[PDB]
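Protocol check, entry for the methods section draft. Step 1: assemble the input record (protein sequence plus ligand SMILES). Step 2: submit for complex structure prediction. Step 3: store the structure tokens unaltered in the notebook. Ligand used here: chloride ion. Step 1 record:
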Amino acid sequence: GAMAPSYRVKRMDIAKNDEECVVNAANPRGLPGDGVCKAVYKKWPESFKNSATPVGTAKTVMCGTYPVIHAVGPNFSNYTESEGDRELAAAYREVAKEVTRLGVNSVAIPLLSTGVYSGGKDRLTQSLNHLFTAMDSTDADVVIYCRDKEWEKKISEAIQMRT
Ligand SMILES: [Cl-]
Ligand SMILES: [Cl-]
Ligand SMILES: [Cl-]
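Step 3, stored output:
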């Protein structure tokens, strides 16, 4: 575990993370996709061997010895608010099981279902709170990766409010 498990946020490409493993914002079919998933495909293409996995689950595939945890958040276009909420919470619970199983001391995570799967809605708070619910019981250092300057500030504020 980390000596003093923390949350941090950085505004940069998750493919340039400084952590012991990465969470992909995957699609259920293990396709290269767009956004985080396309950056992850360019950096760790070997990790997409048999990565397909249903909505609300996580499947880890090794790129060398570097673990890529494919986490499949719901597409809020296709899901109701209620069912989407349940699957988004579940995806993060499966990420917490994988991070624990791998025995890593740190993980790079994106906010699931906040990009092209958001159904056109701002889901920073919803996705972040499900991330916290899952990861709070883990002792990995969690580093959240975002690209928008205003999201960095809001994620930083939410982390600092609980410290
Ligand atoms: Cl960058
Ligand atoms: Cl997304
Ligand atoms: Cl962002």
